[PDB]
Amino acid sequence: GFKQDIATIRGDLRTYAQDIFLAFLNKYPDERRYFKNYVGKSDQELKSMAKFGDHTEKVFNLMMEVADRATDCVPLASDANTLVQMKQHSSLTTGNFEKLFVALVEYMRASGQSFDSQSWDRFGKNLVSALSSAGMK
């Protein structure tokens, strides 16, 4: 289930973080424009770029912490608040996060590894609701 999925992702955080983030950028090319230093780079080029590894690591570690602190895939309002108030997220709208979770769920469904993809979709929906409540446009 969802709790096991957090363990699966955490166990190989670098591979899952990089692969899911790449799936997101590749499914929604306009999203890459927010990450000025990943423009014009292939998947394999990014996988040897230290900054890319560090960024994806930190993003997915935080995502997993928010997921772990959720109850029944409902994230804490305080965690949603953290995400809205980060200066790095100042220009974002809920649609950016929607796209990330659509890509994440698609990745999980396509994977040979078992995932509770339905629950990640629900988690993403609940997170979008919480981001909106916390002031994201």
Ligand code: HEM
């Ligand atoms: C639950 C989902 C998300 C989480 C947990 C998250 C988390 C983070 C974290 C921890 C950082 C700073 C890490 C570092 O030092 O590199 C960061 C930076 C950033 N985030 Fe997110 N993020 C999420 C979604 C998004 C989305 C959907 C976008 C845009 C489509 C976005 C855009 C950015 C940008 C442009 C930065 C600065 C780039 C950089 O760190 O060099 N984030 N995010």
Ligand SMILES: [C-]#N
């Ligand atoms: C940040 N993604």
